Amino acid sequence: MKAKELREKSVEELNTELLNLLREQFNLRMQAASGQLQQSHLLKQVRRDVARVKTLLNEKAGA
Amino acid sequence: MIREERLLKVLRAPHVSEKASTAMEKSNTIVLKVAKDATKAEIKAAVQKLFEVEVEVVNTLVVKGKVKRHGQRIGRRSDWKKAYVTLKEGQNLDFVGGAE
Amino acid sequence: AAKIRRDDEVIVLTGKDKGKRGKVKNVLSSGKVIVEGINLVKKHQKPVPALNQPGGIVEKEAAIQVSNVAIFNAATGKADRVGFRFEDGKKVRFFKSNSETIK
Amino acid sequence: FLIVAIGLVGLIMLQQGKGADMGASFGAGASATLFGSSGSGNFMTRMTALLATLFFIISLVLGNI
Amino acid sequence: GLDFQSAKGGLGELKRRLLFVIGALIVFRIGSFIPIPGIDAAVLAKLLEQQRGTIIEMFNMFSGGALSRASIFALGIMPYISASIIIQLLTVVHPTLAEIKKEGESGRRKISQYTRYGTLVLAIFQSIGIATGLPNMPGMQGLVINPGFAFYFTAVVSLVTGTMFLMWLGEQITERGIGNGISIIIFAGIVAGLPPAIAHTIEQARQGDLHFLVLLLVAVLVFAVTFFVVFVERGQRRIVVNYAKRQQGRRVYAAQSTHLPLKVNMAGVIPAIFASSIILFPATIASWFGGGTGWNWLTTISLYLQPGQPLYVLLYASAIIFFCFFYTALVFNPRETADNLKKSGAFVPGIRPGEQTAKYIDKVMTRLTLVGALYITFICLIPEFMRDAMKVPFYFGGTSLLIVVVVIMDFMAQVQTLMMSSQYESALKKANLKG
Amino acid sequence: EARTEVRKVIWPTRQETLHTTLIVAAVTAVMSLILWGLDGILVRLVSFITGLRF
RNA sequence: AAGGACGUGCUAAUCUGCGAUAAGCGUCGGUAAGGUGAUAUGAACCGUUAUAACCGGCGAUUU
RNA sequence: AAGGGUUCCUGUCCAACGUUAAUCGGGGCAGGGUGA
RNA sequence: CGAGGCACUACGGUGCUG
RNA sequence: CGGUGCCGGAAGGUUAAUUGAUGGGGUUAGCGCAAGCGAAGCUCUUGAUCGAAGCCCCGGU
RNA sequence: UGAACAUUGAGCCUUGAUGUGUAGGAUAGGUGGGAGGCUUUGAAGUGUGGACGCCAGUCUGCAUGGAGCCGACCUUGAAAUACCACCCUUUAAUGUUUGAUGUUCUAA
C-alpha cells in the first residue's frame, strides 16, 4: 500500500514482478479452476501486487 | 528472446470436462482452455518453454458458449476457445512438479 | 454521532424487553443492532441433512432498532446525547445524558 | 468324576453356541455392517449366553479350588 | 479424560455401548489370567520361552497373553481372519460357491455361516495339534494329571469352547455398534504389557539411564510413523460441482447442489491386519507339528520367508504388499459411488452417472491401497536403518507400533466424531444458558 | 511400458499431506494414554480376580 | 472527444463501477470501528480508534 | 447455399407449453459437442 | 477392405480371424 | 385547304423596351407701392421621333 | 465588346453660285446697311457653260481681252435689286458628327 510501494525502487521492483506474474498468480489461477485448491483471499493478493508495481513505472519511473 | 513474458501468458485454465477431453486426453491428444487470445503460435511455444511437454501443431476451434436457457436475463455464457494442443513427446498429463 | 459500539450496554426502550441488557454483538447498516436474548424468534428451520442443518423451531437472533433502545451509562439508565467534544488524538465518548463523564 | 462327565457337557455348550451364530445371522455377516434399529432386546437365546460365560467361571472353581 | 467421560455418558445410546466395549477388553484378560483344566499354565509358560521357532513368538504377540498362559482364547481371533479371506478366494476357484454368494440375502448368509463352521474346524485341528505337540519331546506338561488321552481330550474341549465364545463376542459387539471384534482382540493382547514398562521409566529417570535411552529412541520413531499416517490421510480428491445453474441468485447462486467427497485417503487398516494374520496361520501350526512329532518340511518353508536374518525381510515385504493389495481388490468399492449417484435425484455431467464414473472409482481405489501398502513396508525399514549405528532398541517400532496407531486412530476417528459434537454442544450450552 | 505406467501416474498422485499434524500427534499421544490406561485397569480389576479365582 | 462494442470480481447471469495494472492501482490530506457496491450475502479474509473501507485534490492505466 | 444459432447430443424433470392424453419433445433444467 | 465365421460382454457392443 | 394546325414568303399596314423633340407646371435673383410678369439654376408631368420579333396579309400542305 | 477600308440616310454647318409672282428689258422669297466702281489683265467687247429665254437682254464661274464699273447711275411695286450682313431655301465640295448595312482584320 503506503510504505510498501515507497520502500521499493526502479531496479528492485522489476526483478520481483517476473515472479509475481508468472508462477505465484499463474500457478494459482490454473490450479483454482481445476478444483485442486482455490482460496479466495489468496486471489485478491498477488494479482493486486504485480499490478501495483506497473503503476510506479509510468507514474514517476519508480517511487 | 523469441517472445515476451506477456506472450507467455496465454493459459489460465485447462479443459478436462467429460467425453472427448477426458477420453481424448488419456488415449490421445490433449485439451486446454484458451480464453480469448486468438493465437496458435504462442500456445505451441507455451507448453514447450514453460511446463515440459513438446507438442505438434495446436488446432483451434471456437465454442459459442455453453448455453443457459434462462437466467437473470436469458443466461448465456460468453465465447471461449477449445484447442487441441496435441502431444508428440513427454506423454504426461501435466500437474507434475506441483501446480502449473 | 453515535452511542452504540461493539460492547455497549443498553437497558432497552423496546416494550416486553425493558430491563434487559447485553453486549452489542455486531452493528448492522440497516439501523439495527443485535441485543442478547430478546430478538429471539422460533424459527422453522429445515433439517435437510439432519445433523448438518438443525431441526426444530430454534430460537434465533433477529435485529431491533438503535433509536428505540437506550444506553445505560454506569449508574443511570439515562440516554439523551453523548459528548464527542474531548479529543485524545481521536474523538472519545462521554455522557452528557446525565453529565457523569465516564468514558 | 465331575470333570469327565461335565467335560462331555462342556462340548455340548459349544454346540448351542456355534449354532447361535450360524442362525444368528439375520443382521450379522462376518465383517458385515448393520446398525440394529427397533429390533434386538436380549435374545431368547441369551439364556445360552449366560449358560456359557457361567460355564467357564464354573470350570474355574471346579478345576482348581 | 474426565470431559470425554461426561459427554458419552450424557447421550444414553453411547453410554451403554461403551459399557460393553471397555468390559470386553477386561473379560479378554479375565480368562487369560485364570488357568483352565487339561493343561496347566506354568509348564506352557517356560516352554514358549525356550521356543521351537521364531514363528511361534510372532503368533503369540498378535493373539496376546491368552496363548502365553494356558487359558482360553489362545488360538484367538486369528483363525476367523484366516477363514473369511480363504472363503473369499475359494469363491472364485469354485463354480458352485460363486453362485451361493451372488444369490440374494440367504445365499450371502450361508456363505457367512459356512465360514463360522469353517472357523471351528480349524480350531479343533489346532487344539489337537497344540495339545499333542507339546509333551512328546520338546517339553512336558500336566500337573492336573500327567499326559494321556484324558489330558489332550479335556485340553481340546476347553479351547474349542473358548474360540466359540470369542467369535460370538466379536460378532455381538459389531452388531451393537462401537469397536470391531477383529481390532478388540489384537489390541487387548499386545498393549497389556506396555503400561508397567512406561510407568517404570517415568519414575526412574528423565535425563537418561540405558533402559530409558532405548525406550527414548523408540519414542522418536513412534512419532515419525504417526506423522506419516496423518500425512497420507490429508489430501483433496473430493470433487464439488453443482448440477446445472437453475437461474442465479440466492446465496451466490441457487443450483441443484450435489457434493461428492468420499474416501478419507487412508488404506491398510483392515488389509494389513488380514495380510499378517494369513501368513503366520499355516506357519505357526507347522512349527508346532515339527517341534513336536509331525512335519519337519512344512515348518522349513515357514522359516525360509518370515524373520530370522535381515535377508528374509524382502520376502515378507513382497507378501505384505501383495496380501493387502489382494484383500482390498476383494472388498467391494471400485464402483460403489456410481450406483449411488443414480438413486438420488442428484445428476450432473462432467461426471455423469454410469460407466465413466465407475471407471474413475476403479482408478482411485487401485492407486490408493497400493500407496498405503508401500508406506507399510517403508515403515519397517526405518527402525532397521537408524538402529544400524545407535544401539538396538526393541520396544514399539515396526509391527508393534502400527497395530497401536491403527486401533486408536480408527476407534477415535469414528468415536471422536460423536464425542466432539458432545463437547461442542456442552460448551455452547453453558455459554448460552448457565454453565 | 506396463509397470512404468502405474509408476508415472502414481508419481503425480503422491501428494496427500498437510502441516499441523503435530495436533494429530498430540492426540496420538492421548490415544496412547487410553491404551496405557485401559491395560492399567486390567492389572487393577483382574488382580482382584487373581485373589478370588486364582 | 462525444458515444459505443467487448470484457473485467472470489465465482455467476444481469445491473453498478472500472479497463488486459480492468467492482480497481499510486500519491497527498479528510474520515473511520467496523467492513470487502446489488439480485444473494455466501465463501474466504482484513481492520478495530495508530495499521479495513469510504470521501476529496493530483497522478497512473485507460483493449 | 440462404437463414436460424445450439435449435444438435447427454443426464434429467412435467406446473405451464405441443389442438388432446402425455412417462415423451426442438417445453423446464443445465452441461457436453463443431479440431485442416 | 472383405461374404462369413471364432470369444466375451452390461446386451449398448467391442476384440479375434478371413 | 373555307375553318383549324403546321410549313413557307414579305410587297405593304399595325407595332415594345430604348433614344426624349415639344407643350404644360413649381420654385426665385430681379422688376413691380398692389396685382402680375418673372432671368439663371434645380425640379415635376406630358410625350414628337426611332423600335424588332409577333400580329395582319399572300401562298402551299 | 474592338480597328481600318467601302457604301449611304440623317445632325451642326464651313465655303462658293441663283432665290425668277403681276408689272419689272434681267437674277425682288425678306429684312437692314447703301449713289455707289473710276482700278488698268478686267468687268465689258468677241465666244462659252449655267440663270431667265416671259419684252430688245445681260447676268454670273472662265478663255481671248491692259479697251476705266453698273442693279440698265432705269423703274414698277407692298418691297428694288449692285455689293455687305442674313431670314431661310435650291445646290455642291471640305471639316465633320451619328445611325445603318457592306468589306477586311485580330487584339477581346
Taking the CA of residue E41 and the nearest CA in chain F, the distance in Å comes to 12
Of C68, C5, C16, the C-alpha closest to C38 is C16
Of E382, E369, E266, the C-alpha closest to E313 is E382
Rounded Cα gap, residues D58 and E24, in angstroms: 19
- In this complex, the answer to whether residue B80 has its CB under 7 A from any atom of chain H, a nucleic strand, is no
The x, y and z cell numbers of residue D56, run together, are 467357564
Residue of E nearest to A34 (CA): E239
Q: What residues of chain A have any CB closer than 8 angstroms to a CB in chain B?
A: 18, 21-23, 26-31, 33-34, 36-37
Number of residues in chain F: 54
Q: Which nucleotide is nearest to A29 (CA to C1')?
A: G10
- In this complex, the answer to whether residue E249 has its CB under 7 A from any atom of chain H, a nucleic strand, is no
Contact E232, E268 (CB under 8 A): no
- Chains E+D touching (3+ CB pairs under 8 Å): yes
Is position D12 within any domain?
no
DSSP states along C17-45: -TT-------B-TTSEE--TTTS-EEEE-
C-alpha distances in Å from residue E347, one per residue of E11, E236, E259:
37, 22, 11
Cβ-proximal residues to E379 (8 Å cutoff; 6+ apart), any chain: E225, E228, E398, E401, E402
User: Counting one residue from B and one from E, how many pairs have CB atoms under 8 Å apart?
Assistant: 19
Rounded Cα gap, residues E304 and C75, in angstroms: 89
- In this complex, the answer to whether residue E347 has its CB under 7 A from any atom of chain H, a nucleic strand, is yes
Q: Which nucleotide is nearest to C7 (CA to C1')?
A: G33
Contact B5, A21 (CB under 8 A): yes
Rounded Cα gap, residues F54 and F50, in angstroms: 5
Residue C21 buriedness (CB in 10 A; 0-12 / 13-18 / 19+): middle
* C-alpha E128, offset from chain centre: 26
The x, y and z cell numbers of residue C19, run together, are 430491563
Q: Which nucleotide is nearest to B78 (CA to C1')?
A: G7
Chain A touching partners, 3 or more CB pairs below 8 A: B, E
Contact E217, E243 (CB under 8 A): no
With an 8 Å Cβ cutoff, is E245 touching chain B?
yes
E301, amino acid identity = I
Q: Which nucleotide is nearest to B19 (CA to C1')?
A: H32
Quick check: B99 and A31 CB within 8 A?
A: yes
Contact E232, E372 (CB under 8 A): yes
Distance of C1' in J58 from CA in E82, Å = 155
Quick check: B100 and A33 CB within 8 A?
A: no
Of E175, E180, E169, the C-alpha closest to E414 is E180
Q: What is the DSSP code (8-state) at residue E72?
A: T
The x, y and z cell numbers of residue E260, run together, are 461428492
Chain G: positions less than 7 Å from a protein CB are: 6-14, 20-22, 24-28, 32-35, 39-45, 48-50, 52, 59-61
Of E99, E120, E123, the C-alpha closest to E110 is E99
Residue C83 host element (H or E):
strand C82-83
Q: What is the DSSP code (8-state) at residue C91?
A: B
Q: What is the DSSP code (8-state) at residue E427?
A: H
Contact E110, E100 (CB under 8 A): yes
* C-alpha C37, offset from chain centre: 11
Of E417, E416, E172, the C-alpha closest to F34 is E416
Taking the CA of residue A40 and the nearest CA in chain E, the distance in Å comes to 14
The x, y and z cell numbers of residue C84, run together, are 464527542
Chain B touching partners, 3 or more CB pairs below 8 A: A, E, F
Name the protein residue, with chain letter, whose CA is nearest the C1' of G38.
E249
Q: Which residues pair with B84 in a beta bridge?
A: B31, B59
Rounded Cα gap, residues E197 and E112, in angstroms: 41
With an 8 Å Cβ cutoff, is F9 touching chain E?
yes
Residue of E nearest to B17 (CA): E350
Quick check: E174 and D4 CB within 8 A?
A: no
With an 8 Å Cβ cutoff, is B7 touching chain A?
no
Q: Which residue has the cell 535425563?
A: E207
The x, y and z cell numbers of residue E28, run together, are 479378554
Rounded Cα gap, residues B14 and A33, in angstroms: 8
Quick check: E356 and B22 CB within 8 A?
A: yes
Cβ-proximal residues to A43 (8 Å cutoff; 6+ apart), any chain: A28, A29, A32
- In this complex, the answer to whether residue E342 has its CB under 7 A from any atom of chain H, a nucleic strand, is yes
Q: What is the DSSP code (8-state) at residue E68?
A: T
Q: Which nucleotide is nearest to B22 (CA to C1')?
A: H32
Quick check: E1 and F33 CB within 8 A?
A: yes
Q: Which long-range contacts (CB under 8 A, 24 or more apart) does E115-119 make?
A: E115/D30, E115/E80, E115/E83, E115/E84, E115/E87, E116/D18, E116/D21, E116/D22, E116/D30, E116/E80, E116/E167, E117/D18, E117/D22, E118/E83, E118/E86, E118/E87, E119/E79, E119/E80, E119/E83, E119/E163, E119/E167
With an 8 Å Cβ cutoff, is B16 touching chain F?
no
Rounded Cα gap, residues B58 and D64, in angstroms: 88
Quick check: E120 and D18 CB within 8 A?
A: yes
Number of residues in chain E: 435
Of E271, E284, E279, E326, the C-alpha closest to E88 is E326
Name the protein residue, with chain letter, whose CA is nearest the C1' of H13.
E345
Chain H: positions less than 7 Å from a protein CB are: 5-8, 10-13, 27-36
Q: Which residue has the cell 445428476?
A: E347
Quick check: A33 and B14 CB within 8 A?
A: yes
Q: Are strands B80-84 and C41-44 parallel, antiparallel or unpaired?
A: unpaired
Quick check: F16 and E265 CB within 8 A?
A: yes
The alpha carbon torsion through E289, E292, E296, E298 (nearest 10 deg) reads 10
With an 8 Å Cβ cutoff, is D3 touching chain E?
yes
Rounded Cα gap, residues E115 and D28, in angstroms: 13
User: Counting one residue from D and one from F, how many pairs have CB atoms under 8 Å apart?
Assistant: 3
Cβ-proximal residues to E69 (8 Å cutoff; 6+ apart), any chain: E32, E33, E35, E41, E44, E45
The B 4-33 residues near strand H by Cβ under 7 Å are 15, 17-21, 24, 28-29, 31
Rounded Cα gap, residues D38 and E306, in angstroms: 48
Question: Which residues of chain D are within 8 Å of residue F53 when distances are taken between CB atoms?
Answer: 57, 60-61
The x, y and z cell numbers of residue E315, run together, are 520376502
Cβ-proximal residues to E266 (8 Å cutoff; 6+ apart), any chain: E229, E232, E233, E372
Cβ-proximal residues to E384 (8 Å cutoff; 6+ apart), any chain: E310, E313
The x, y and z cell numbers of residue C37, run together, are 436474548
The x, y and z cell numbers of residue D24, run together, are 444368528
Phi, psi of C38, rounded to the nearest 5 degrees:
-125, -30
Q: Which long-range contacts (CB under 8 A, 24 or more apart) does E411-419 make?
A: E411/E179, E411/E183, E412/F27, E412/F31, E412/F34, E414/E178, E415/E178, E416/F27, E418/E8, E418/E11, E418/E14, E419/E4, E419/E7, E419/E8
Of B52, B37, B29, B45, the C-alpha closest to B98 is B52
Residue D19 buriedness (CB in 10 A; 0-12 / 13-18 / 19+): middle
A30, amino acid identity = M
* C-alpha F41, offset from chain centre: 20
Show the domain range for D56: 41-65
Rounded Cα gap, residues D4 and B6, in angstroms: 95
Distance of C1' in H8 from CA in E257, Å = 27
With an 8 Å Cβ cutoff, is E407 touching chain F?
yes
The x, y and z cell numbers of residue E89, run together, are 478366494
* Domains identified in chain C and CATH numbers: 1-72 (2.30.30.30), 74-103 (no CATH)
Rounded Cα gap, residues B51 and E156, in angstroms: 69
The alpha carbon torsion through E393, E398, E399, E400 (nearest 10 deg) reads 50
Rounded Cα gap, residues E288 and E67, in angstroms: 13
Distance of C1' in K56 from CA in B84, Å = 160
Q: What is the resolution of this structure in A?
A: 9.5
Q: Which residues pair with C44 in a beta bridge?
A: C57
Residue of F nearest to B26 (CA): F9
Of F40, C7, D30, B84, the C-alpha closest to E79 is D30
For B2-96, the fitting CATH number among 3.40.50.300, 2.10.109.10, 3.30.70.330, 2.30.42.10 is 3.30.70.330
Distance of C1' in G56 from CA in B6, Å = 36
Distance of C1' in J34 from CA in F29, Å = 164
The x, y and z cell numbers of residue B99, run together, are 501446480
Q: Which of F10, F39, F43, F45 to mutate to test the interface with E (most CBs of E within 10 A)?
A: F39
Q: Which residue has the cell 494369513?
A: E278
Alpha helix (H) ranges present in E205-312? 211-233, 270-291, 297-305
Method in brief: cryo-EM
Residue C57 host element (H or E):
strand C57-60
Q: DSSP strand E in B1-100: where? A: 31-34, 54-55, 59-63, 80-84, 87-89
* C-alpha E113, offset from chain centre: 22
Residue A56 host element (H or E):
helix A40-60
Rounded Cα gap, residues E230 and E233, in angstroms: 5
Question: Which residues of chain D are within 8 Å of residue E175 when distances are taken between CB atoms?
Answer: 27-28, 34, 36
